[PDB]
C-alpha cells in the first residue's frame, strides 16, 4: 500500500487523515511518495541528562531532562516546517554535536556505522526529507537526508 513504515492516522484536533512513519517519526498530511548503499544526512542533536555523554561544545554539563530535550526538538521542528528558521541555521546554533560547525552535516555513510535508530531513520527518509524526533543513546535527533 504505502512506502516502508507508513500508516494512516486521523488528526485528533481536525479529524482529517494524515500519514505517520514509525521509523522516521515523520508525519505529513499528504499520502507519501512511493535502498541505496549509502545516504548523506545532517542532524541536529539535543542531549539530555541521560545521554551517553551529557556534555557538548555548548555545555560542559548538560542537565536538561529527556522531556525538556524533546520539547526543544519539537519547537525546532515547528520553526523548520513553518519556514521561520532553516534546519542548517538551527543545527549550527543549537546542535549538541560537533557537526554543528558543519551545519549538522555528518557526510555519507553505509549501514553498520551509525547507531541503529539513527541508521534506520536515515535510510527510510527520502532525499530531501526530514525526520521527526529520533531517539538514540546520544540524545534526540532531527535528521535531514541530503543525498
Q: Using the 8-state DSSP alphabet, how is residue 32 labeled?
A: P
- Establish whether 138 is a catalytic residue: yes
Closest Cα to residue 6, out of 27, 21, 28, 18? 21
Name the grid cell of 91.
543545527
Q: In the sheet that 17-21 helps form, which strands lie side by side, from edge to edge?
A: 6-10, 17-21, 27-28
Q: Which of 97, 99, 122, 131 is catalytic?
A: 97
Q: Is 98 left (phi over 0), alpha (psi -120 to 50) or beta?
A: alpha
With cell 525526520, the residue in question is 131
Residue 136 vs 146, nearer CB to ligand A1ED1: 136
Residue of 77, 136, 140, 142 interacting with ligand A1ED1 (CB under 6 A): 136
| Minimum gap (Å) between residue 30 Cβ and ligand A1ED1 | 28
- Establish whether 115 is a catalytic residue: yes
| Minimum gap (Å) between residue 31 Cβ and ligand A1ED1 | 29
Name the grid cell of 51.
545521554
Residue of 138, 140, 144, 145 interacting with ligand A1ED1 (CB under 6 A): 138
- Establish whether 48 is a catalytic residue: no
* Catalytic (active-site) positions: 43, 97, 115, 138, 141
Q: Rule CB under 6 A: which residues touch ligand A1ED1?
A: 45, 97, 106, 114-115, 118, 136, 138
Amino acid at each position: 500500500k504505502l512506502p516502508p513504515g507508513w500508516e494512516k492516522a486521523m488528526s485528533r484536533s481536525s479529524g482529517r487523515v494524515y500519514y505517520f512513519n514509525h521509523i522516521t517519526n515523520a508525519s505529513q498530511w499528504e499520502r507519501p511518495s512511493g535502498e541505496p548503499a549509502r545516504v548523506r544526512c545532517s542532524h541536529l542533536l539535543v542531549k539530555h541528562s541521560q545521554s551517553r555523554r551529557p556534555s557538548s561544545w555548548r555545555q560542559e554539563k548538560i542537565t536538561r531532562t529527556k522531556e525538556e530535550a524533546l520539547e526543544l526538538i519539537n519547537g525546532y521542528i515547528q520553526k523548520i516546517k513553518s519556514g521561520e528558521e532553516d534546519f542548517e541555521s538551527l543545527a549550527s546554533q543549537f546542535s549538541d554535536c560537533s557537526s554543528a560547525k558543519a551545519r549538522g552535516d555528518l557526510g555519507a555513510f553505509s549501514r553498520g556505522q551509525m547507531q541503529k535508530p539513527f541508521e534506520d531513520a536515515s535510510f527510510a527518509l527520502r532525499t530531501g526529507e526530514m525526520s521527526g524526533p529520533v531517539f538514540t543513546d546520544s540524545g534526540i535527533h532531527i535528521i535531514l537526508r541530503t543525498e
